[PDB]
Design goal:
homodimer, alpha+beta, 60s Ribosomal Protein L30, Chain: A, 4 strands, membrane protein, Structural Genomics, PSI-Biology
Amino acid sequence: VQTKHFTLKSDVLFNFNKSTLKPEGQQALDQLYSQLSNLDPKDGSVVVLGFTDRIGSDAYNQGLSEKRAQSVVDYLISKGIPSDKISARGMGESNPVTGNTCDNVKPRAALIDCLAPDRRVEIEVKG
Amino acid sequence: EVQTKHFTLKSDVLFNFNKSTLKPEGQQALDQLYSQLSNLDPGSVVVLGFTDRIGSDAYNQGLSEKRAQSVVDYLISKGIPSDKISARGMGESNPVTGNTCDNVKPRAALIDCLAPDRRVEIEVKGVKDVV
């Protein structure tokens, strides 16, 4: 089994608290799909995971992350990924890539900036 | 299970126009990357440099090599062992913009349209730990 893992910035794909792909988001997914289409495997699978930062309501962040992941999957299916070979999952605030690095960044705007790497969609491709 | 994790960095942030020396903002972006890399449990790293299709292909190939090497040199300085990372210039090959920019004018507009092509890709390859 060999995966390839990719990451896209949620701040690019979506507006603040929204889950509709922006034009910039579609373009980012077009560019990724261009890369993914360079291989023609017999079979494979794609897993799309949405993540938020640790700020705000966890129930709201879970819901938002799931809708974001779904919007990405729906678009990628539109581009050509077969619907039964791709799945979406919202992971909410879990598994931050910033780990404990932003733990003591106090001022709200500075913390939001420090947490930016956590606001992301991860795409795992198996072939 | 062998897994490759891919990271993409905008060349326009890392480097000034036509230069291969990291800007301070490039070092800061690589510091952020290194933090995340240092949490991936070991492994090897390839750094790919890409340009847009403007100008000499020989020149673009050389510029892409120097940019990739600059990134590698700095990542080693952060703690990536020297024997586990390498640089590769890709010049103008393998663009991500498709045909999207094919008929774009004027020139300033074209440089903007091709921006996603100007990038450094970092591939971290490793084995899933098990027993």
